[PDB]
Amino acid sequence: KSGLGTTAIHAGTLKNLYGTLAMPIYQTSTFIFDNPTTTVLENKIAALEEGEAGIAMSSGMGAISSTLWTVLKAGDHVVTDKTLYGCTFALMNHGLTRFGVEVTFVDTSNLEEVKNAMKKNTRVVYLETPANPNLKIVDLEALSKIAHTNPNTLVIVDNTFATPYMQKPLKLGVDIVVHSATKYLNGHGDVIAGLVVTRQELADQIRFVGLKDMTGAVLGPQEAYYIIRGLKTFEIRMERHCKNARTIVDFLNKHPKVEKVYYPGLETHPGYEIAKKQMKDFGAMISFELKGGFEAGKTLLNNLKLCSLAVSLGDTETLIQHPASMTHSPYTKEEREVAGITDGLVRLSVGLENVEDIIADLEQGLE
Amino acid sequence: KSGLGTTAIHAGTLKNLYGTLAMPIYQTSTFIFDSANPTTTVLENKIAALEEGEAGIAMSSGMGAISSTLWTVLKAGDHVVTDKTTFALMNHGLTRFGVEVTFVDTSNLEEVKNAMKKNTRVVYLETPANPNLKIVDLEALSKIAHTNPNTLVIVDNTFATPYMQKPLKLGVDIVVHSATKYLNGHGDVIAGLVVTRQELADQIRFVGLKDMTGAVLGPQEAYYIIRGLKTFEIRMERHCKNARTIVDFLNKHPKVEKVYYPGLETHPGYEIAKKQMKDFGAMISFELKGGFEAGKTLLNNLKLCSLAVSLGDTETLIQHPASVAGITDGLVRLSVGLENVEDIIADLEQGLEKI
Amino acid sequence: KSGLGTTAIHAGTLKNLYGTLAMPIYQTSTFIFDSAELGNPTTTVLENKIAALEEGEAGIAMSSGMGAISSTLWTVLKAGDHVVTDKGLTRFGVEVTFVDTSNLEEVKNAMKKNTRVVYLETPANLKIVDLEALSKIAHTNPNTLVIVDNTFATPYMQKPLKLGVDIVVHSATKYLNGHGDVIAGLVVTRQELADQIRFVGLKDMTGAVLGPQEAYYIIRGLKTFEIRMERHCKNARTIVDFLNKVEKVYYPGLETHPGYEIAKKQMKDFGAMISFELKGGFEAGKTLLNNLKLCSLAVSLGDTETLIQHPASMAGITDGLVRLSVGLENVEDIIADLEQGLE
Amino acid sequence: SGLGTTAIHAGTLKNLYGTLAMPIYQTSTFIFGNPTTTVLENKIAALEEGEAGIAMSSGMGAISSTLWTVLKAGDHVVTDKTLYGCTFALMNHGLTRFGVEVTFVDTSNLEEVKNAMKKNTRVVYLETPANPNLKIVDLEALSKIAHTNPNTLVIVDNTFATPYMQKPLKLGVDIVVHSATKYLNGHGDVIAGLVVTRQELADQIRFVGLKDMTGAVLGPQEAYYIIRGLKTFEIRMERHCKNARTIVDFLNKHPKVEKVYYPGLETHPGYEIAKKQMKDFGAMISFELKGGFEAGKTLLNNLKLCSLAVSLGDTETLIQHPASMTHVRLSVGLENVEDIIADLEQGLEK
């Protein structure tokens, strides 16, 4: 009965109990007989995703790994994408495989390539949309029905980029939604954290097996506070993030020194029509190709005076990165090529600065 | 040169960098490049200096220290030897992912010698142990475990603390702490610590922590622990002075049958404890001649001691596990605080007269 | 010269010295010195920030709004000085005359020779006062300083130093921090009075030191300062019309509001506080307030949650007076909760 | 119960929160003064054995909030000329600028405090031990003089000694104040002040001086840190003193030092007064090197453990040379005394 800002600001409040609207910080570890702060944040994110239960962990990787250590075992099979955000790619290709888990990598945008990758022992289909680093879109509802043909399969979606402001995968059939709260949900570049939302049945097992026993990735109470506090402005931050991005996209698309732009809002974008039906907005992550390749990325980034060179995203400050010179410096040509880092690719996370100043720093920087 | 107090206070200082003795709290999730966590790092160096290992790693819980390590050094097929009495992970979690586990009485040197398989990748130890404060010989066990070129010895040093016991000086490969207890000292942080040689540490950081657990300690929690470490030596002193005065009062007491404490010569592994440990701890278990209700009643009339399951806090904690494996139904576990010993004893003395 | 969001987010940052955009929290009391040959780096960033937003020379942080005004007042006054402000000090040899600061002539005719401080607050039933016109007046005495509590308006609507005011003070406790969890005060003015207020008022007279943690919190709050104020006012504009269809509504954006023209002239926006007067008595207000789901019953202003107050149940005040602090919620849910409660 | 148990447990709300650790009420807005800070106010007040405690955001915040409450233009203050730095500035240039009379005497001489009383003398303000040479004064006898005048409150700055050593309220003092920034927090990471006094006096200090005249509010996080720091308050002071006592012996005999000011040295002016007020003689040491100015510089610039800083009462040993910096004082920290002595010796060499 209540809107997104309202939900984020008030869901889970304990004002009738403490007399404060602001949740006290229970910086404690010894409860007495004869964590409250984290719970509020868990009830909040659940409300925002419209699921039954939330779980907080100390990082995005803590939220994913705790979930996968709970619902997997040796002998299980996992279907995911050839390109995921790293760290979860290392967990998939190197970590689970040392412990008897089969992992098939496919193009999740191809619906049938997902269908025929599936086996009796498939326990997890794990998806990302939008996804690094060309913002691949992927039809979550189409994929969830092509995976529940197997009555034992869970669909897990990393909803970090879209946030519950643009996408609620649990409404499109998904079973488990995971967030890197480090990005947009906290929003303030000062917290590593992760969140999970799923049914109460599943959530209780991820908390009491995967979190308590398999990772121990507890979120600190002060960090739980920082995220509750961050959420008070979640809605207007995403509004300004997305409003700034759209203008920056047009700037980059009509720029002579720029060859291509990757952005789910463009109609030239691959999964454009898919992106339009499941996303209320087209996101604040923009990627684009540079004409002058490697040395054009270096020179562009080395002249920007307002944008900050970093490999996080979702901060109130605008962050820019050039995977080839930085993140993927010690890689091969074909390691980077497919998929999908090229020599000119630049990643931008649009912050909340006044868009005129972001573009002015972009403009002078492109020359 | 430096004493334990000097080491815990100054090891890893960056006072040359910030012009401050107190380490700034780098509450950040984004580092920026010149071209195309220091708070936690200070704490990682601190625990390493105290245990006299190469390298420290911090995690958001004790279980995040232990799990991060085991996901690093194990794979499907490996075998683990550990003690009978973290248990869910050993007994249910690893076995679900193709690791084999043998539980033995690490008390008996030859049960360990005989549980050794060739694919034994980890001997995982803990001393003193729960809840009867079982002692276990770390040096003897490392020689046993190391006749396999591939076996790592991992010791949970949470109870002993590097004030009383440095397992790496006795041949151990890896030390883990639930920093939640004595190292932080203040009942207000969940956190874990690992100390090992540089190459094992790098692998635990960049495989176990980064990809397998993601148990990142919050910078603010790191700061609290650094601050807790400023009083680590005097706290362990007062913990252990208190605890010894209290042990006597409980041994020579009418309604207490037995008192589990490594400092008593009647305690099973007292001679091992005495060579291993610079002191005998601040955990006291004991049994009341009343069993249950001894027991469930004594704990109800306590007015200073608090009813909790954690340990190593500034306040004295107590619990009665009966409210099948070591838990004799008259057993009571005391975690001795920093209070004045008169007041703890008087409180205990009072609540003992109520039965 | 960048936009309000860019300077709120980026002004005063030491991002190339720490390798992070987030300022390290210097939870410290004692600095070491390199060789044998009163301020905090985190706090210092905050002071630089509010100074850049007010387009002033220097900022000072204090552990409360009252710490901010009392620190400056104990600097710039002595026994025998005189103060004029709008309808404590007197126990220590300063005389205070209270005038209606919206009567230009009533202020000008109250200027004594020993008048050292004129202290204004606009908005305040949201009374407006002409800050430029009142400053020319006070400035007829060379040793008179004008001090404006710019808390209600913000540097997003009002920059008093650009209208000839000498000192801006804020209870950052309200809009600037935004999130209801910090008591703090701020002061912006010229460098040399700033150094006087710090080294005398703050150092010896009050000791009202802002904690570095609270300073970090406020810097964080300022990261969304521009978009919070946008959203606040927009919600206020929609709720103000709704409330105005209760006999009367006090809001500087209604042209039927007394200082509407001074307001339009000085304030780039009309603010996010609303007062209105309920037709029913002392017991129709308390009945409304004892009956809202969303709005919360509290005496403060500028949070993310919408707050409301019936100053009667909780001279100036009537039995039908209600103060509304419009939060950041979705507008329809706010309006719905006002509505359901009015019935 | 004992001083450790009190500092750990006084003011507990374990019955209501289900935790031994006080949650951090990081709030400004209450629905229908702070619960974390309150727990700390009851803690200090139990430690000093007064009725009520107040917390301010600074030692100066504690002091000025007290003075701005109990004084008025026309009143008179008797205080010492050797006073803590910023208390001096306030007393000398601040009160006098708002109608207050201050006479600076030597509070060692009971005859010249008696002879500085006036009918309108509202406050006698004392400091024992006192900078920069650990001066001692008789709290009983001075409170007996001041109280012959029926409107005179005696205010004592109990920072150095702390309630581990000196409880002025039991010696007849009316108000005790603290820079909790030092020993009480203990950890060199908080700026805070504390007042302990009678309830009626405290309510006025709270609701006049704090609420209206200074607004020197302690943040709730800073309040949490101090409650935490107090969890070990007893054992830090015990170790502070044992270290400093041994450094005292060492410093008293080193050929390159003239005199060693410390209250436990029976050679010290005021020794027998300290022996009756003080349960222990403190952890500040000062001394004079025969090399004078260039000896101080060259000592402090060869210390590798002792840190060169202004403050005192931290877990780290702090050192400062009053001729090189503020215009030799030693704050003994919690290190092993052997390490501290050896760092002093290798630096005394030079």
CATH number of D3-228: 3.40.640.10
Q: Please say whether the structural domain B4-227 has been given the CATH code 3.40.640.10.
A: yes
Q: Which residue in C93, C181, C183 is closest to D217 by CB distance? A: C183
For D196-218, give one letter per residue: b (16+ CB within 10 A) or e.
Answer: bbeeebbebbbebbbeebbbbbb
C273-277 and C248-250: which strand pairing?
antiparallel
Other Cβ atoms within 10 Å of C14 Cβ, number: 15
Q: Which residue in B308, B338, B342 is closest to D235 by CB distance? A: B338
C25 interface with D at CB cutoff 8 Å: no
| Per-residue tokens: D306 | 């002792």
The helices-and-strands tally (H runs, E runs) of chain D is 14, 12
Q: For residue A194, what are the CA distances in angstroms to A44, A324, C45?
A: 13, 28, 29
B221 vs D contacts (CB less than 8 Å): none
Instruction: Name the CA dihedral angle for A256, A258, A260, A265, rounded to a multiple of 10 degrees.
Output: -90
Q: For residue A65, what are the CA distances in angstroms to A52, A116, B58, B213, C303?
A: 20, 26, 18, 6, 37
Chain Cα centroid distance, residue C25 = 25
Cα(C10)–Cα(C79) distance, integer angstroms = 42
Q: Which residues pair with B284 in a beta bridge?
A: B334
D224 interface with A at CB cutoff 8 Å: yes
* Count of residues making up chain B: 355
Residue type, D200: E
Other Cβ atoms within 10 Å of C284 Cβ, number: 17
B192-196 and B256-260: which strand pairing?
unpaired
Helix or strand holding residue B81 (H, E): strand B79-83
For D49-82, give one letter per residue: b (16+ CB within 10 A) or e.
Answer: ebebbbbbbbbbbbbbbbbbbbbbbebbbbbbeb
- Residue of chain B whose alpha carbon sits nearest to that of C217: B27
Q: Which among D163, D213, D219 has a CA at the least distance from the CA of D191?
A: D219
The domains spanning A4-228 and A229-366 adopt the same CATH topology: no
| Cited resolution, angstroms | 2.5
Q: Which residues pair with B152 in a beta bridge?
A: B122
Domain parsing of chain C, residue ranges: 4-220, 221-342
Q: For residue D215, what are the CA distances in angstroms to A68, C169, C196, C203, D279?
A: 52, 13, 18, 13, 35
Q: 3-class SS at C262? A: helix
Distance from CA of A218 to the nearest CA of D (A): 18
Q: Cβ contacts of residue B89 below 8 Å, gap of 6+? A: A213, A214, B63, B66, B67, B70
Dihedral sign of CA atoms D90, D96, D99, D104 in order: positive
D101-105 and D76-80: which strand pairing?
parallel
Name the phi and psi angles at B219, rounded to 5.
-50, -35
Q: At what angle do helices C212-222 and D220-230 cross, to 10 degrees?
A: 150
Cα(C122)–Cα(C133) distance, integer angstroms = 13
Q: 3-class SS at B122? A: strand
Q: For residue D91, what are the CA distances in angstroms to C76, C79, C98, D272?
A: 17, 15, 30, 29
Q: Do D311 and C93 touch (CB under 8 A)?
A: no
Cα(A268)–Cα(A278) distance, integer angstroms = 18
| Per-residue tokens: A313 | 């995203």
Q: For residue A58, what are the CA distances in angstroms to A62, A191, B68?
A: 6, 9, 13
Name the phi and psi angles at D255, rounded to 5.
-60, -20
Q: Which among D36, D334, D222 has a CA at the least distance from the CA of C27?
A: D222
B295 upstream amide cis, omega within 30 of 0:
yes
Helix or strand holding residue C235 (H, E): helix C225-244
Q: Cβ contacts of residue A277 below 8 Å, gap of 6+? A: none
D335 vs B contacts (CB less than 8 Å): 3, 5-6, 9-10
Can you give chain A as a three-state secondary structure string? Answer: CCCHHHHHHHCCCCHHHHCECCCCECCCCCECCCCHHHHHHHHHHHHHHCCCEEEEECCHHHHHHHHHHHHCCCCCEEEEECCCCCCHHHHHHHHCHHHCCEEEEECCCCHHHHHCCCCCCEEEEEEECCECCCCECCCHHHHHHCCCCCCCCEEEEECCCCHHHHCCHHHCCCCEEEEECCCCCCCCCCCCCEEEEECHHHHHHHHHHHHHHHHCCCCCHHHHHHHHHHHCCHHHHHHHHHHHHHHHHHHHHCCCCEEEEECCCCCCCCCHHHHHHHCCCCCCEEEEEECCHHHHHHHHHHHCCCCEECCCCCCCCCEEECCCCCCCCCCCHHHHHCCCCCCCCEEEECCCCCHHHHHHHHHHHHC
Q: Do A30 and D19 touch (CB under 8 A)?
A: yes
DSSP labels, C321-340:
EEEEE--SS-HHHHHHHHHH
Cα(A55)–Cα(B23) distance, integer angstroms = 31
What DSSP character marks residue D185?
T
Residues A281, A238 contacting (CB under 8 angstroms): yes
CB burial of residue B105 (10 Å; 0-12, 13-18, 19+): middle
- Residue of chain B whose alpha carbon sits nearest to that of A86: B211
Residues D55, D40 contacting (CB under 8 angstroms): yes
Q: For residue B16, what are the CA distances in angstroms to B20, B22, D266?
A: 8, 11, 39
Q: Cβ contacts of residue D98 below 8 Å, gap of 6+? A: C77, C78, C79, C92, C93, C94, D73
Q: Which among A135, A183, A161, A136 has a CA at the least distance from the CA of A287?
A: A135
Q: 3-class SS at C250? A: strand
Q: 3-class SS at D246? A: helix
Residues A3, C332 contacting (CB under 8 angstroms): yes
According to CATH, the topology of domain C221-342 is Aspartate Aminotransferase, domain 1 (3.90.1150)
Q: Which among C189, C153, C146 has a CA at the least distance from the CA of C174?
A: C153
CB burial of residue B282 (10 Å; 0-12, 13-18, 19+): buried
| Per-residue tokens: B192 | 């874990």
A59 interface with B at CB cutoff 8 Å: yes
DSSP labels, D23-77:
PB---S-B----HHHHHHHHHHHHHHT-SEEEEESSHHHHHHHHHHHH--TT-EE
Residue type, B192: G
What DSSP character marks residue C115?
E
Helix or strand holding residue C99 (H, E): strand C95-99
Cα(B64)–Cα(C75) distance, integer angstroms = 54
Q: Do C5 and A352 touch (CB under 8 A)?
A: yes
The architecture in CATH of the region A229-366 reads Alpha-Beta Complex (3.90)
Cα(B160)–Cα(B158) distance, integer angstroms = 6
Helices (H), chain B: 4-10, 15-18, 38-51, 62-73, 87-88, 109-115, 138-145, 161-164, 198-203, 219-229, 232-251, 270-276, 341-353
Instruction: Please report the beta strands in C121-220, taking only residues with DSSP state E, as ranges in sequence order.
Output: 145-149, 167-170, 185-189
Q: Residue with structure tokens 């509304």? A: C324
Q: Cβ contacts of residue D259 below 8 Å, gap of 6+? A: D287, D288
Q: Which among A54, A70, A313 has a CA at the least distance from the CA of A170?
A: A54
Q: Which residue in B21, B306, B339 is closest to D4 by CB distance? A: B339
Distance from CA of A347 to the nearest CA of B (A): 13
* Count of residues making up chain A: 367
Q: For residue C189, what are the CA distances in angstroms to A191, B162, C147, D298?
A: 34, 54, 10, 42
Q: Do A237 and C226 touch (CB under 8 A)?
A: no
Q: Which residues pair with B194 in a beta bridge?
A: B57, B176
DSSP labels, B148-178:
STTPEEEEE-TTTHHHH--GGGGT-SEEEEE
Residues A312, B29 contacting (CB under 8 angstroms): yes
Name the phi and psi angles at B188, rounded to 5.
-135, 10
Residue type, C312: A
B306 interface with D at CB cutoff 8 Å: yes
Q: Which among D323, D203, D231 has a CA at the least distance from the CA of D21?
A: D231
Cα angle vertex C231, ends C227, C237, to 5°?
Answer: 145
Residues D194, D7 contacting (CB under 8 angstroms): no
CATH number of D229-349: 3.90.1150.10
What DSSP character marks residue B92?
I
Residues B195, B59 contacting (CB under 8 angstroms): no
| Per-residue tokens: B79 | 């075998």
Residues D217, D101 contacting (CB under 8 angstroms): no
Cα(D258)–Cα(B150) distance, integer angstroms = 64
B317-319 and B306-307: which strand pairing?
parallel
Q: Cβ contacts of residue D200 below 8 Å, gap of 6+? A: none
C67 vs D contacts (CB less than 8 Å): 57, 214-217
Q: Which among B82, A332, D61 has a CA at the least distance from the CA of C66?
A: D61
- Named by the residue before each, gaps in chain D exceeding 2.5 A from C to N are 32, 327
Residues D212, D61 contacting (CB under 8 angstroms): no
Q: Which residue in B21, B186, B234 is closest to D314 by CB distance? A: B21
Cα(A51)–Cα(A46) distance, integer angstroms = 5
Residues B325, B318 contacting (CB under 8 angstroms): no
Cα(A206)–Cα(C164) distance, integer angstroms = 62
Q: Give me the sheet containing A53-57, strands edge to edge.
A: A53-57, A194-198, A176-180, A154-158, A122-128, A77-81, A102-106
Chain Cα centroid distance, residue C137 = 23
Residues C167, C148 contacting (CB under 8 angstroms): yes
Residue type, B348: L
The architecture in CATH of the region B228-354 reads Alpha-Beta Complex (3.90)
Q: Which residue in B29, B32, B223 is closest to C27 by CB distance? A: B223
CATH number of C4-220: 3.40.640.10
D76-80 and D193-197: which strand pairing?
unpaired
| Per-residue tokens: B89 | 């992970």
Helix or strand holding residue D340 (H, E): helix D337-349
B307 interface with A at CB cutoff 8 Å: yes
Q: 3-class SS at C118? A: strand
CATH class held by domain A4-228:
alpha beta
Residues A141, A173 contacting (CB under 8 angstroms): yes
Q: Do D187 and B22 touch (CB under 8 A)?
A: yes
Cα(C202)–Cα(C208) distance, integer angstroms = 6
Q: Cβ contacts of residue C174 below 8 Å, gap of 6+? A: C151, C152, C300, C301, C302, C303
The helices-and-strands tally (H runs, E runs) of chain B is 13, 12
Helix or strand holding residue C227 (H, E): helix C225-244
For C239-275, give one letter per residue: b (16+ CB within 10 A) or e.
Answer: bbeebeebeebbbbbbeebebbebbeebbebbbbbbb
Q: Cβ contacts of residue A281 below 8 Å, gap of 6+? A: A165, A166, A238, A242
The helices-and-strands tally (H runs, E runs) of chain C is 12, 12
Can you give D105-162 as a three-state secondary structure string? Answer: ECCCCHHHHHCCCCCCEEEEEEECCECCCCECCCHHHHHHHHCCCCCCEEEEECCCCH
Q: Is C169 left (phi over 0), alpha (psi -120 to 50) or beta?
A: beta
DSSP labels, B294-317:
SSTTGGGS-SSSEE-S--S-SS-E
Cα angle vertex A82, ends A80, A87, to 5°?
Answer: 80
* Count of residues making up chain D: 350
Q: For residue C66, what are the CA distances in angstroms to B149, B327, C69, D75?
A: 70, 59, 5, 25
Cα(A129)–Cα(A140) distance, integer angstroms = 8
Cα(B76)–Cα(B203) distance, integer angstroms = 18
Q: Cβ contacts of residue B43 below 8 Å, gap of 6+? A: B12, B56, B58, B193, B217, B222, B225, B226, B229
Cα(B12)–Cα(B222) distance, integer angstroms = 13
Distance from CA of B5 to the nearest CA of D (A): 5
Other Cβ atoms within 10 Å of A333 Cβ, number: 7
Q: Which among A313, A361, A322, A335 has a CA at the least distance from the CA of A82?
A: A335
C273-277 and C321-325: which strand pairing?
antiparallel
Chain Cα centroid distance, residue A231 = 16
Q: 3-class SS at B288? A: strand
Cα(C260)–Cα(C252) distance, integer angstroms = 6
A122-128 and B283-288: which strand pairing?
unpaired
Instruction: Name the CA dihedral angle for B9, B10, B11, B12, rounded to a multiple of 10 degrees.
Output: 120
Residue type, A29: S
Residues B130, B335 contacting (CB under 8 angstroms): no
Residues B192, B59 contacting (CB under 8 angstroms): yes
